[PDB]
């Protein structure tokens, strides 16, 4: 990250045997990297953030609703999160390089857990 950065900016300025082929293979490369490691990141903070929206906004319903056409948008609202433990568990299990990001997939289906059953602890 810093070798390969310093490595770089040493290819860059000088002569042309080596430096200019390695220089821009070296650029070729990172591009490709930092090209999926962008579409990884992306992914990953769509989905949680999907996720806390959904989990706060229907655990404020089955809040209003425990005293009184929202038990609709609440059930509907209720089985989008159903089918998220999905994609939250079949995306911990691509995020085996960051556990700081592996983590808050984790925390992320805890809230949903915990609200898909909290809405179920009602109904049922």
Aim: glycine share 0%; net charge negative; hydrophobic share 35%.
């Amino acid at each position: 990250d810093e070798e390969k950065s310093k490595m770089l900016a040493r290819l860059l300025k000088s002569s042309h045997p080596e430096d200019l082929r390695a220089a821009n293979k070296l650029i070729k490369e990172m591009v490709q990297e930092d090209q999926k490691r962008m579409e990884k990141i992306s992914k990953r903070v769509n989905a949680i953030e999907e996720v806390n929206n959904n989990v706060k906004l229907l655990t404020e319903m089955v809040m209003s609703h425990s005293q009184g056409s929202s038990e609709d948008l609440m059930k509907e609202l209720y089985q989008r999160c159903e089918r998220m433990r999905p994609t939250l568990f079949r995306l911990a299990s691509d995020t085996e390089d960051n556990d700081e990001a592996l983590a808050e997939i984790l925390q992320a289906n805890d809230n949903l857990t915990q609200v898909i059953n909290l809405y179920k602890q009602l109904v049922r």
